């Protein structure tokens, strides 16, 4: 495409949700 603008005329891409830290950072805490 010539302008950067076409993600939003063509097809949008679904945004991927974030992971939550609350168990993943305390439990590495421990560890590591």
Same mark, same amino acid.
């Given at each position: 495409?010539?302008?950067? @603008?076409?993600? %939003?005329?063509?097809? +949008?891409?679904?945004? +991927? %949700? +974030?992971?939550? #830290? #609350? @168990?993943?950072?305390?439990? #590495? %805490?421990? %560890?590591?």
């Amino acid at each position: 495409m010539a302008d950067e @603008s076409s993600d %939003a005329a063509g097809e +949008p891409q679904p945004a +991927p %949700a +974030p992971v939550r #830290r #609350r @168990s993943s950072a305390n439990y #590495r %805490a421990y %560890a590591t």
